[PDB]
Design a protein around this ligand. Structure first.
Ligand SMILES: C=C[C@H]1CN(Cc2ccccn2)C(=O)[C@@H]2CCC[C@H]1N2[S@](=O)c1cc(Cl)cc(Cl)c1
Length: 128
């Protein structure tokens, strides 16, 4: 399925080249510009654990998730990954725990040492 495919066929987008965050572009977005640090970014996403369970979805809430890029308001992989996306792009990310919740995990659903899968859509990005 999609998690296996990004595991086996994704591109390493980390600065360290440690394979901690792999990406596939599923839908090409608009033009060449990616967001800049501090931009307000609007995303839709779904996340799955390695046991196949969906653990989160913005679609199911009927509202996007909004954060300021590059500020550690999200897991490291999201700051790295969304920074690579164009407006309108849909991507898959496959994230080792060092770029997510590490050994701590995150109650209630994310265990220790969890590799995570996301599908993300970058809806919009704006400076403030
Ligand atoms: C509102 C949910 C955010 C939570 N965070 C930031 C964060 C803040 C505080 C505690 C744990 N994570 C995040 O960095 C990432 C990426 C952005 C989307 C969501 N998460 S994960 O999908 C997530 C989903 C759910 Cl249901 C619970 C948790 Cl602990 C984490």
């Amino acid at each position: 399925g999609a998690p296996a495919t990004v595991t086996e066929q994704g591109e390493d987008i980390t600065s360290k080249k440690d394979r901690g965050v792999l990406k596939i572009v599923k839908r090409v977005g608009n033009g060449e510009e990616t967001p800049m640090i501090g931009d307000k970014v609007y995303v839709h996403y779904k996340g799955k654990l390695s046991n196949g369970k969906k653990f989160d979805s913005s679609h199911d809430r009927n509202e996007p998730f909004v954060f300021s890029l590059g500020k550690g308001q999200v897991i490291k992989a999201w700051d790295i990954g969304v920074a690579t996306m164009k407006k309108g792009e849909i991507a898959h990310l496959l994230i080792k725990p060092e770029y997510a919740y590490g050994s701590a995990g995150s109650l209630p659903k994310i265990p220790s040492n969890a590799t995570l899968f996301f599908e993300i859509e970058l809806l919009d990005f704006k400076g403030e």
